[PDB]
């Protein structure tokens, strides 16, 4: 049976996707100090939307992209220089 | 394989001793449960609450399964708020960090 990854996310991992209101974004539930932000493109297929939002959904990792915040005002509400991932995911059930 | 990917995943069904798990508050059953995708309920044993820093409010903790016991409700009024005849598990668990 499949388990949910909570760190070191790989393509094909099952993940718990949760709302992070501080960063105005969905993230992967993790014990890591690194932020894994859900790519905006993946929201529709997970029955998620860009005013109250569902707290969590299960998904499967399809893609991840390494990023560094090079502008202070960014869509992720992270400080300048933050190193993070953007993750595309699809639904699982 | 010469090595395993170690301690990077939590179980969400068919829980086995030693599994890492997400423990969550089940308000409708007035009890902590293992987060699961299966219809079977896995209730946290009352013995396990103090060492997890829970009280008989905190929404969730990561844990490790120390024991599971398959049970059936014999009375309609019971601490788990389940109908008479419900089959469920009681799980002992300790905190897990890393």
Residue numbers in the entry:
A (entry chain A): 1493 to 1542, 1549 to 1591
B (entry chain C): 1487 to 1542, 1551 to 1592
Paper text:
As a core molecular machinery in mammalian autophagy, the ULK complex is composed of a serine–threonine ULK1/2 kinase, ATG13, ATG101, and FIP200 (also named as RB1CC1), and functions as a master regulator in the initiation of autophagy under the nutrient deprivation condition by linking the upstream nutrient sensors with the downstream autophagy machines. The ULK complex initiates the autophagosome formation, and has recently been implicated in selective autophagy by interacting with autophagy receptors through its FIP200 subunit. Here, we discover that the interactions of FIP200 Claw domain with autophagy receptors CCPG1 and Optineurin can be regulated by the phosphorylation in their respective FIP200-binding regions. In all, our findings uncover a general and phosphoregulatable binding mode shared by many autophagy receptors to interact with FIP200 Claw for autophagosome biogenesis, and are valuable for further understanding the molecular mechanism of selective autophagy.
Interestingly, we also determined an apo-form crystal structure of the FIP200 Claw dimer, in which the highly positively charged LHP region of one Claw monomer is occupied by an aromatic Phe residue together with a preceding negatively charged Glu residue from the remaining sequences of the N-terminal cleaved 3C protease site of a neighboring FIP200 Claw dimer, likely due to crystal packing. Inspired by these structural observations, we inferred that an aromatic residue (Phe, Tyr, or Trp) corresponding to the I106 residue of CCPG1 FIR2 may also occupy the LHP of FIP200. Moreover, the dimerization of the FIP200 Claw domain in the FIP200 Claw/p-CCPG1 FIR2 complex is mediated by more additional polar interactions, such as the two Arg–Asp pairs (Arg1491–Asp1500) and two Arg-Glu pairs (Arg1499-Glu1494) of salt bridges, and buries a much larger surface area compared with that of the apo-form FIP200 Claw (~786 vs ~730 Å2).
